Paper text:
Protein tyrosine phosphatases (PTPs) play a critical role in regulating cellular functions by selectively dephosphorylating their substrates. The ∼280 residue PTP catalytic domain consists of an α/β structure, and biochemical and structural studies have led to a detailed understanding of the catalytic mechanism (Barford et al., 1994; Zhang, 2002). Key features of the domain include the PTP signature motif, the mobile Trp-Pro-Asp “WPD” loop that in the closed conformation positions the conserved and catalytically important aspartate residue, and the phosphotyrosine recognition loop. Here we report the crystal structures of 22 PTP domains, including two tandem-domain RPTP structures and a detailed structural comparison of this protein family.
We also report here structures of two tandem-domain RPTPs, RPTPɛ and RPTPγ, revealing the domain organization for the PTP subgroups R4 and R5. Superimposition of all five tandem-domain RPTP structures (CD45, LAR, RPTPσ, RPTPγ, and RPTPɛ) showed that the orientation of the D1 and D2 domains is highly conserved and root mean square deviation (rmsd) values of less than 4.4 Å were obtained, for each pairwise comparison, considering Cα positions of both domains. Surprisingly, sedimentation velocity measurements showed that all single-domain RPTPs studied (IA2, IA2β, GLEPP1, DEP1, and STEP) were entirely monomeric in solution, as were tandem-domain receptor PTPs (RPTPα, CD45, RPTPɛ, and RPTPμ). The determined molecular masses calculated from AUC velocity data ranged from 68.5 kDa to 74.2 kDa in agreement with the theoretical mass of monomeric tandem domains. Moreover, analysis of tandem-domain structures showed that the orientation of D1 and D2 domains is highly conserved and is incompatible with the inhibitory wedge model due to a steric clash of D2 domains. In the present study we showed that this is also true for RPTPɛ, which is in the R4 subgroup together with RPTPα, the prototype of the inhibitory wedge model. In the fourth category, both the gateway and secondary pocket are blocked and the inaccessible binding cavity harbors an aromatic residue or a proline in position of Arg24. The second-site loop assumes a twisted conformation in these phosphatases. This architecture is present in the subgroups NT5 (PTPH1, MEG1), NT6 (PTPD1, PTPD2), R1 (CD45), R2B (RPTPμ, RPTPκ, RPTPρ), and R4 (RPTPα, RPTPɛ). RPTPα, RPTPɛ, and RPTPσ displayed a more limited peptide recognition capacity in vitro, which may be related to the presence of a bulky residue in the gateway region.
Residue numbers in the entry: 112 to 128, 136 to 181, 183 to 281, 288 to 406, 425 to 472, 478 to 574, 581 to 691
Write the structure that this text describes.
């Protein structure tokens, strides 16, 4: 196994689709585990087969209690940086205090948690931080100063002290699935950049932990190391590195499926890599790339089954089977897909304009997924083409099957008209649903301003925080295009306000992987940039 030039990475990935992974050394033959197996230390290890060797063991200061030296953690090098990380086992009740003493004695500023607390009812790691307020863990008082919950990870700011108090930031990756590795490595690369951002140049080693302290924790350390190697050597050698880190902590990467995943992340980071940009700071090429996002046509069964054919305005813009909106019972089908927002999963329902023969279903979707906000981006007719069925009453009330819609208020503001309805189901019988009907999109082309588009996003956000905080029903006609533009800018703008960063490309690309042809035309993509420019001023 020799190094792969990045020039040939994509090809070698194809060719290798297990044997490589099985040739790695299990770090056990050049190692010594005397200290880890001491009787005194038995109860301190979560898994008795996954133990630090004596040489790279993190060694705590001796606290007159015997065998107080020990913790299940080991130093791990980065690409050209001795001891960049500490790969630690996720602490348990009995070692929570010893854990913080490590963070303190090692001068660490960052903890990377790659596990959830419980997994399918099995406790994979004990909570070692206060929910609210403060807690003294031994001679170290930890205090929560902030918690920010984004969709793929959450971020916690601690203030630890026993003279100078110190700020430790915990980055907790929530998205990692129970069984197997993730799906895209998109989330993990963004997460890994946020760690680079929040760790100070002067700080101690980064504490990375999962359950056993080898596996996720390993795939994470390797992906960082190998990004470094690309950015320096223009070549990647995953095999020689995993081999190296195992002689510091054995078993570092745990699965065949994990080893492959390092490569996928590395490829993603090469092919698409730098498309993020800071709000401080051509599109043609980026759009070509977006357009080469494969459509998972295998994974589109339900939407193509014969009965469901007739229910779609465009038999080509149709939900993937995994993130499709499913209703109470082929009556389970509505051309509509769940889409991740910036702060939570399944935050938007991106749907088509109801057909005259799918209003019943439409309103069942709204009712069954507790939607209270509808964003409409077309008019009923456009250029003499019937682009959406009017599903809402204008004057009185209308009953679409079991649901009843009665219109309470209807205010035509600048660009957006804003209707209010009492949706009933013929004491949890009645809701108030609010429709934002955007008249600011031209019958042909994109709008040339985007003040009115900023003002709609903004309007829908207040409505969300008030009628808090359910999934938003966005539709136009085809159910991807404008819906896409809107969902994209919603997420892009939230993050600009929040992180002061801007990655339109990945934003849209992430939309393409949830529903086909989401942002659709280069016009609409250009527009995204244009609205962000307008927002910045
Ligand atoms: Cl949890
Ligand atoms: Cl694991």
């Amino acid at each position: 196994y020799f190094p792969i030039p990045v020039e040939h990475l994509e090809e070698e990935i194809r060719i290798r689709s297990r044997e490589e992974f099985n040739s790695l050394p299990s770090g056990h033959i050049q190692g010594t585990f005397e200290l880890a197996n001491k009787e005194e230390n038995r109860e301190k290890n979560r898994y008795p087969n996954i133990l630090p060797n004596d040489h790279s063991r993190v060694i705590l200061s001796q606290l007159g209690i015997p065998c107080s030296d020990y913790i299940n953690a080991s130093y791990i090098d980065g690409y050209k940086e001795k001891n960049k990380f500490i790969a630690a086992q996720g602490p348990k009740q009995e070692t929570v205090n010893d854990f913080w003493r490590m963070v303190w004695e090692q001068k660490s500023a960052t903890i990377v948690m790659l596990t959830n607390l419980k997994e399918r009812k099995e406790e994979k790691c004990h909570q070692y931080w206060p929910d609210q307020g403060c807690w003294t863990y031994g001679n170290i008082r930890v205090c929560v100063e902030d918690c920010v919950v984004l969709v793929d990870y959450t971020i916690r700011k601690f203030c630890i002290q026993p003279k100078a108090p110190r700020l430790v930031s915990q980055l907790h990756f929530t998205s990692w699935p129970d069984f197997g590795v993730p799906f895209t490595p998109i989330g993990m690369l963004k997460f890994l950049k946020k760690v680079k951002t929040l760790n100070p140049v002067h700080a101690g080693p980064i504490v990375v932990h999962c359950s056993a302290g080898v596996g996720r924790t390993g795939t994470f350390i390797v992906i960082d190391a190998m990004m470094a190697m690309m950015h320096a050597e223009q070549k990647v050698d995953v095999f020689e590195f995993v081999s190296r880190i195992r002689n510091q902590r054995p078993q570092m990467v745990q699965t065949d499926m994990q080893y492959t995943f390092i490569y996928q992340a590395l490829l993603e980071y090469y092919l698409y890599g730098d498309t993020e940009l800071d709000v401080s700071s051509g599109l043609e090429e980026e759009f070509r790339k977006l357009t080469n996002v494969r459509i998972m046509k295998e994974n589109m069964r339900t939407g193509n089954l014969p009965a469901n054919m007739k229910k779609a305005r465009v038999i080509q813009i149709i939900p993937y089977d995994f993130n499709r909106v499913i209703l109470s019972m082929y009556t389970d089908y509505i051309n509509a897909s769940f889409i991740d927002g910036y702060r939570q999963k399944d935050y938007f329902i991106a749907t088509q304009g109801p057909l005259a023969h799918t209003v019943e279903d439409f309103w069942r979707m709204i009712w069954e997924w507790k939607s209270h906000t509808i964003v409409m981006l077309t008019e009923v007719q456009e250029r003499e083409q019937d682009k959406c069925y009017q599903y809402w009453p204008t004057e009185g009330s209308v009953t679409h099957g079991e649901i009843t819609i009665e219109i309470k208020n209807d205010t035509l503001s600048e660009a957006i008209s804003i209707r209010d309805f009492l949706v009933t189901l013929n004491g949890e019988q009645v809701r108030v649903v609010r429709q934002f009907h955007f008249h600011g999109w031209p019958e042909i082309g994109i709008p040339a301003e985007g003040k009115g588009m900023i003002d709609l996003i903004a309007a829908v956000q207040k409505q969300q925080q008030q009628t808090g905080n359910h999934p938003i029903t966005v539709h136009c006609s085809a159910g991807a295009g404008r819906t896409g533009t809107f969902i994209a800018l919603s997420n892009i703008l939230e993050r600009v306000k929040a992180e002061g960063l801007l990655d339109v490309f990945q934003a849209v690309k992430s939309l393409r992987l949830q529903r086909p042809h989401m942002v659709q035309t280069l016009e609409q993509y250009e527009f995204c940039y244009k609205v962000v420019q307008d927002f910045i001023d």
